[PDB]
Amino acid sequence: DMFIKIDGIEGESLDANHKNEIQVLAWNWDVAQKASVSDFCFAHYIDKASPNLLSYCLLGKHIKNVQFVLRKAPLEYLTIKFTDVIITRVDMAGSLETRPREEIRFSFTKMTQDYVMQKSGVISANYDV
Template identity: 45%
Template sequence: LGSGKVSVTNLDFDHYIDRASPNLFKYCASGKHIPQAILVMRKAGGNPLEYLKYTFTDLIVAVVSPSGSHDGEIASRETVELSFSTVKQEYVVQNQQGGSGGTITAGYD
């Protein structure tokens, strides 16, 4: 194998169209750069654990693509694609009691 170059692509996610949708569309249409943004994922339950966090710098909303509902769902969805200069990923390992068992981090600059 020869030397290669790392390629970290845009991050895309799918979500129900909600109150964030107009702002996501506005940022996409304007091409405005966002200095920093954080995307957090939580487990469901009475004491939801934040198990995954992305911190982006110099972010733009590259794509907003409404797709309607899927598989009999009532609510419509959209796919959002984020382009960024740097990203830090933090994954929280869940312990047997359902709490935090430590964090694993990685990043790209």
């Protein structure tokens, strides 16, 4: 299970620990070679958050915190937290065979990546621009 919590933009997950967050279907992020850091990318079904992701994109409205979480099917073993997020792309599509989905890309000035070991410690990275 994968979830993303976006300040001011609710989704519709019915998970007990992530109520009203966005269920993530796919994601990616990369960093190359002072480094070149790409937009963070996720996919979700078109849902409650969709019209607000579109507005925020179209306006360049800033989002204070975003939190992305991966859970084993129930340890939340990976957490990435982002600051000063800007929604930079919204891509939607559907066909006749599940619901339509949308891919979102966003920028950020800071991040923290926490990985949780087992129950042992935590290993972490962060970055700033």
